[PDB]
Coordinates of all heavy atoms in Angstrom, one line a residue:
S294 N 5.6 142.0 -89.1 CA 6.0 141.6 -90.4 C 6.2 142.7 -91.3 O 5.8 143.9 -91.0 CB 4.8 140.7 -91.0 OG 5.0 140.4 -92.4
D295 N 6.9 142.5 -92.4 CA 7.2 143.5 -93.4 C 6.2 143.4 -94.6 O 6.3 144.2 -95.6 CB 8.6 143.3 -93.9 CG 8.9 141.8 -94.3 OD1 8.6 140.9 -93.5 OD2 9.4 141.6 -95.5
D296 N 5.4 142.4 -94.6 CA 4.5 142.1 -95.7 C 3.1 142.8 -95.5 O 2.5 142.7 -94.4 CB 4.2 140.6 -95.8 CG 3.2 140.2 -96.9 OD1 3.6 140.2 -98.1 OD2 2.0 139.9 -96.6
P297 N 2.7 143.6 -96.4 CA 1.5 144.4 -96.3 C 0.3 143.6 -95.8 O -0.4 144.0 -94.8 CB 1.2 144.9 -97.8 CG 2.7 145.2 -98.2 CD 3.5 144.1 -97.6
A298 N -0.1 142.5 -96.5 CA -1.2 141.6 -96.0 C -1.1 141.2 -94.6 O -2.1 141.3 -93.8 CB -1.3 140.4 -96.9
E299 N 0.1 140.8 -94.2 CA 0.3 140.4 -92.8 C 0.1 141.5 -91.8 O -0.5 141.3 -90.8 CB 1.8 139.9 -92.6 CG 1.9 138.5 -92.3 CD 1.3 137.6 -93.3 OE1 1.9 137.4 -94.4 OE2 0.2 137.1 -93.1
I300 N 0.6 142.7 -92.2 CA 0.4 143.9 -91.3 C -1.1 144.2 -91.2 O -1.6 144.3 -90.1 CB 1.1 145.1 -92.0 CG1 2.6 144.8 -92.0 CG2 0.8 146.4 -91.2 CD1 3.5 146.0 -92.5
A301 N -1.8 144.3 -92.4 CA -3.2 144.5 -92.4 C -4.0 143.5 -91.5 O -4.9 143.9 -90.7 CB -3.7 144.5 -93.8
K302 N -3.7 142.3 -91.7 CA -4.3 141.2 -90.9 C -4.1 141.5 -89.4 O -5.0 141.6 -88.7 CB -3.7 139.8 -91.2 CG -4.6 138.7 -91.0 CD -3.9 137.4 -90.6 CE -2.9 136.9 -91.7 NZ -1.9 135.9 -91.1
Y303 N -2.8 141.6 -89.0 CA -2.4 141.8 -87.7 C -3.2 143.1 -87.1 O -3.6 143.0 -85.9 CB -0.9 142.0 -87.6 CG -0.4 142.3 -86.2 CD1 -0.1 141.3 -85.3 CD2 -0.5 143.6 -85.7 CE1 0.3 141.6 -84.0 CE2 -0.1 143.9 -84.4 CZ 0.2 142.9 -83.5 OH 0.5 143.2 -82.2
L304 N -3.3 144.1 -87.8 CA -4.0 145.3 -87.2 C -5.5 145.0 -86.9 O -6.0 145.4 -85.9 CB -3.8 146.5 -88.2 CG -2.4 147.0 -88.3 CD1 -2.4 148.3 -89.2 CD2 -1.8 147.3 -86.9
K305 N -6.1 144.4 -87.9 CA -7.6 144.1 -87.7 C -7.8 143.1 -86.5 O -8.9 142.9 -86.0 CB -8.2 143.6 -89.0 CG -8.0 144.6 -90.1 CD -8.4 144.0 -91.5 CE -8.2 145.0 -92.6 NZ -8.6 144.5 -93.9
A306 N -6.7 142.4 -86.1 CA -6.7 141.4 -85.1 C -6.4 142.0 -83.7 O -6.8 141.3 -82.7 CB -5.7 140.3 -85.4
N307 N -5.8 143.1 -83.6 CA -5.4 143.7 -82.4 C -5.9 145.1 -82.1 O -6.4 145.8 -83.0 CB -3.9 143.7 -82.3 CG -3.3 142.3 -82.3 OD1 -3.2 141.7 -81.2 ND2 -2.9 141.8 -83.5
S308 N -5.7 145.5 -80.9 CA -6.0 146.9 -80.4 C -4.6 147.4 -80.2 O -3.7 146.8 -79.6 CB -6.7 146.8 -79.0 OG -6.7 148.0 -78.3
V309 N -4.4 148.6 -80.9 CA -3.0 149.2 -80.8 C -3.1 150.6 -80.1 O -3.9 151.4 -80.4 CB -2.5 149.5 -82.2 CG1 -1.1 150.1 -82.2 CG2 -2.5 148.2 -83.1
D310 N -2.2 150.7 -79.1 CA -2.2 152.0 -78.3 C -1.6 153.1 -79.1 O -0.5 152.9 -79.6 CB -1.6 151.8 -76.9 CG -2.3 150.7 -76.1 OD1 -3.6 150.6 -76.2 OD2 -1.6 149.9 -75.4
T311 N -2.2 154.2 -79.1 CA -1.7 155.4 -79.9 C -2.1 156.7 -79.2 O -2.8 156.7 -78.2 CB -2.3 155.4 -81.3 OG1 -3.7 155.7 -81.1 CG2 -2.2 154.1 -82.0
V312 N -1.5 157.8 -79.7 CA -1.8 159.1 -79.2 C -3.3 159.4 -79.3 O -3.7 160.4 -78.7 CB -1.0 160.2 -80.0 CG1 0.5 160.0 -79.9 CG2 -1.4 160.1 -81.5
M313 N -4.0 158.6 -80.0 CA -5.5 158.8 -80.2 C -6.3 157.9 -79.2 O -7.5 157.9 -79.2 CB -6.0 158.4 -81.6 CG -5.6 159.4 -82.7 SD -6.2 158.8 -84.3 CE -8.0 158.7 -84.0
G314 N -5.6 157.1 -78.4 CA -6.2 156.1 -77.6 C -6.1 154.8 -78.2 O -5.5 154.7 -79.3
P315 N -6.6 153.7 -77.7 CA -6.5 152.4 -78.3 C -7.3 152.3 -79.6 O -8.5 152.8 -79.6 CB -6.9 151.4 -77.2 CG -8.0 152.1 -76.5 CD -7.4 153.6 -76.4
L316 N -6.8 151.7 -80.6 CA -7.4 151.6 -81.9 C -7.6 150.2 -82.3 O -6.8 149.3 -82.1 CB -6.6 152.3 -83.0 CG -6.2 153.8 -82.8 CD1 -5.5 154.3 -84.0 CD2 -7.5 154.6 -82.6
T317 N -8.8 149.9 -82.9 CA -9.1 148.6 -83.3 C -9.9 148.9 -84.6 O -10.7 149.8 -84.7 CB -9.9 147.9 -82.2 OG1 -10.0 146.5 -82.6 CG2 -11.3 148.5 -82.0
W318 N -9.7 148.0 -85.7 CA -10.3 148.2 -87.0 C -11.3 147.0 -87.3 O -11.0 145.9 -86.9 CB -9.3 148.3 -88.1 CG -8.3 149.4 -88.0 CD1 -8.4 150.6 -88.7 CD2 -7.1 149.5 -87.2 NE1 -7.3 151.4 -88.3 CE2 -6.5 150.8 -87.4 CE3 -6.5 148.6 -86.3 CZ2 -5.3 151.2 -86.8 CZ3 -5.3 149.0 -85.7 CH2 -4.7 150.3 -85.9
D319 N -12.3 147.3 -88.1 CA -13.2 146.3 -88.5 C -12.5 145.6 -89.8 O -11.4 145.9 -90.1 CB -14.6 146.8 -88.9 CG -14.6 147.9 -90.0 OD1 -13.6 147.9 -90.8 OD2 -15.6 148.6 -90.1
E320 N -13.2 144.7 -90.4 CA -12.7 144.0 -91.6 C -12.5 145.0 -92.8 O -11.7 144.7 -93.6 CB -13.5 142.8 -92.0 CG -12.8 141.5 -91.6 CD -11.4 141.4 -92.0 OE1 -11.1 141.6 -93.2 OE2 -10.5 141.1 -91.1
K321 N -13.3 146.0 -92.8 CA -13.2 147.0 -93.9 C -12.0 147.9 -93.7 O -11.6 148.6 -94.7 CB -14.4 147.9 -94.0 CG -15.8 147.3 -94.2 CD -16.9 148.4 -94.2 CE -17.3 148.9 -92.7 NZ -16.4 149.9 -92.1
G322 N -11.4 147.9 -92.5 CA -10.3 148.8 -92.2 C -10.7 150.1 -91.6 O -9.9 151.1 -91.6

């Protein structure tokens, strides 16, 4: 999504693979 809230939601919902290893965020971000 292009919407900030949607993006933020989506990130806290998933594990994202990155150069730092898989990342997952708590509700605080």
Side-chain angles (χ1 to χ4, degrees):
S294 168
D295 52 307
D296 179 77
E299 244 61 74
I300 296 186
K302 207 211 299 160
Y303 179 92
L304 294 185
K305 302 170 181 181
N307 296 275
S308 164
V309 183
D310 301 323
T311 67
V312 295
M313 289 177 61
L316 303 183
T317 191
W318 298 263
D319 61 19
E320 256 310 307
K321 300 177 281 81

